[PDB]
Design a protein around this ligand. Structure first.
Ligand SMILES: [Mg+2]
Ligand SMILES: [Mg+2]
Lengths: 344, 359
């Protein structure tokens, strides 16, 4: 069958969907993935045929309303949820022209969207084909829905709907221990780490004598550890999937799929705020005991936390528990059958 | 487990192995793929972690022996088989230092090589882990082995072997109807078309009413474009700008075969690599050309089956094209081959065979 995957505005939204997309391709399905123009190279880097859904970047939808007037960044966790619902809603509305033109020439039998790829729900409803929602991180997929519903009121009304439609299938990659008490039924799936590739250097897969700390996007100068900085004491391009398993600490902001890659490898995490706000997903990992949550702008806080994550085995113990949970989940190749069941 | 894939010197050798490698990765295995430096970006383009097995290009192994002496180019299919055995052998010998170094730090539990990735057999024997040979096209995987076993006699001797070892498993992607009478037993696998990707443009996945003929990497464009069919020319990026300005109004340049082939009525190629499989998979008739007069056997078998024409010149390509479009037989035979391919075990299932070899 033809399956259209719909990612969003950032590389993690592409890679969240890559394992299922590639599994579907490997089962003989014809698979396209769409995202904003800036993300098309990221889709291509996963080896998946790539289409653009808008020629505007995520910043355009984040920083301005539909009329082009500037909108401020959110300041609280509650504002975060609401503001994100709106920007993802704007991006979705802005994606419809290109999705219509693509699907007029290559008509999918099934549409798969990430957590807040709301254009996937809309185009699926327009075509009358089933819509699958895949969680693109361990955060609650539905958490921005009320605001997104309000943003998309006009588009939803044109389809005869009062709110965002329920998916035909919800596919969840969150380990059971981290799923909220109010989580809906889901087809579970093991997310297998994936990211773009270049050429591996020996250090990427060979750990030295000292503890290895990966920072994704001075402190650490007294730890006597090997620090690797993953950018655009070694710096530069770092394939997370290959390098994370060699690490003892991963330092990130719980945006994207980095937390999942760390948990999958049983590696303790140090989680800093994203903007001025800790991400809810990251707090739940911290609560479980597989990470430490820390404000970087307190001097020595990061240094102290790294020391704790390296010297106290319990964090790694909890990380390996999460790793075990992930490994027990249905494979992407298995989940392809659930997709097939929706159209036959 | 850790699985090392070993491709070779051309993009098809990478893409031939990509479906099983990505399926193994998707099953939770740690997967690396090695090839010559020039092919590393092609491995990367498949989304697979990539290591270089040698910094030397394929031309070095083809044109000179290990001692720097020039090698005489083959003039016949028979000479070609011995010639390829020796040059793939030299490429394999030149790959061992890097493979030794990689596997000292990241030790695989299993090694999978393409048809003539002989360094895969050598490194697996040295490590004492199972070796899987996967056919990388519909041609006979073993057909250069005698010359390859001569080329690698010293490396093989050091491992206590008199010739190239039998793989622990042979995985074959050749449709049953095209397998020769003497084909060895295999685990069959459905090959799924894969290649590098870049932004799709609408023409790539839109078929028109007018027949579409794909040429893989002038008088033909003028001829064929009068008036029945359009021609799409797949090229490398070095010559894409040159050919566009030499042939205005023609789709020429980067072409993703997996996306474009299903829209075509004919695929025109020389039967190297995985193009024949991509055409057959989509049920598309093929026009096969020779490089001088060095007919690829795999292509002759597809023509013998009736899903392709092998034609020897500017005017005669036009003729075979009219035939492959006009006579419905050719597409009928191609769809039969497509059906045979769809019935073969999925890469996701074949991963279970790899797992069974270690446990
Ligand atoms: Mg104002
Ligand atoms: Mg000899």
């Amino acid at each position: 069958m033809k399956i259209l995957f719909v990612a969003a505005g950032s590389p993690a939204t592409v890679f969240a969907l890559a394992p299922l997309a590639t599994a579907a391709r490997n089962a003989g399905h014809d698979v396209f993935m769409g995202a904003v123009e800036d993300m098309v190279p990221y889709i291509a880097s996963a080896g998946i045929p790539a289409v653009a859904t808008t020629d505007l970047p995520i910043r355009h939808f984040i920083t301005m309303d539909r009329e082009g007037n500037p909108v401020r960044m959110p300041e609280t966790p509650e504002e975060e949820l609401d503001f994100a619902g709106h920007w993802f809603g704007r991006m979705a509305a802005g994606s419809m022209d290109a999705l219509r033109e693509v699907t007029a020439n290559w008509r999918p039998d099934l549409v798969v969207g990430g957590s807040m790829s709301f254009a996937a729900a809309l185009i699926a409803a327009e075509l009358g084909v089933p819509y699958v929602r895949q969680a693109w991180d361990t955060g609650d997929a539905w958490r921005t829905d009320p605001a997104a519903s309000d943003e998309l009121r006009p588009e939803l009304r044109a389809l005869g709907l009062d709110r965002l439609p329920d998916p035909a299938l919800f596919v969840d990659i969150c380990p059971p221990s981290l799923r909220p008490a109010d989580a809906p039924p889901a087809q579970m799936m093991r997310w297998v780490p994936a990211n773009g590739q270049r050429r591996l250097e020996p250090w990427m897969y060979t750990k030295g004598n000292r503890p290895r700390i990966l920072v994704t996007s001075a402190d650490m100068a007294a730890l006597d550890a090997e620090v690797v900085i993953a950018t655009l004491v070694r710096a530069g391009w770092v394939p997370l999937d290959v390098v994370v398993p060699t690490c003892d600490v991963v330092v990130h902001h719980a945006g994207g799929v980095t937390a999942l890659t760390a948990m999958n490898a049983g590696v303790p995490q140090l989680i800093v705020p994203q903007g001025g706000n800790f991400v809810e997903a990251g707090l739940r990992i911290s609560d479980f005991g597989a990470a430490i949550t820390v404000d970087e702008n307190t001097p020595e806080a990061v240094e102290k936390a790294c020391g704790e994550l390296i010297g106290n085995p319990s964090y790694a113990e909890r990380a390996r528990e999460l790793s075990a949970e992930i490994a027990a989940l249905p494979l992407p190749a298995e989940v392809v059958g659930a997709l097939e069941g929706l159209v036959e």
